[model samples]
Target: PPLSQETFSDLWKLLKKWKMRRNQFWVKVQRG
Candidate 1:
């Protein structure tokens, strides 16, 4: 069965956080 809307919402929230963290890490590496 397909994921429920609630599940998708939570996944999206986590994905956004992960992307933000990745970008921060990339910037830190670039600075080093």
Candidate 2:
């Protein structure tokens, strides 16, 4: 069965949020 569009959108947004947080954490760790 194909995944629903609505569910996919929710996951995509969460992924973006996670990516942003990861970037921030890396910057802080490197002080760059």
Candidate 3:
């Protein structure tokens, strides 16, 4: 079954925030 447009958008927003946080963590680790 296909996801509704709103559901997909919400999923994408969550993924974007997760990726951003992961990147920030890695950057801090690299600097330390």
TM-score of 1: 0.31
lDDT of 1 at 4: 77
Worst 10 residues of 2 by lDDT: 1-10
* Candidate 1, superposed: residue stretches over 4 Å from native: 20-32
Pairs that collide, model 3: none
**lDDT (Cα, 0-100) at 14 in candidate 1:** 71
CA RMSD (A), model 1: 5.3
Top TM-score hit? 1
lDDT of 2 by residue, 1-32 (tens): 33778666777677677768666775777774
lDDT of 3 by residue, 1-32 (tens): 44678666777677677778666775786785
Pitting candidate 1 against candidate 2, the one with the higher TM-score is 1
C-alpha lDDT (0 to 100) for residue 1 of candidate 2: 36
lDDT of 1 by residue, 1-31 (tens): 3367866677767777777866677678678
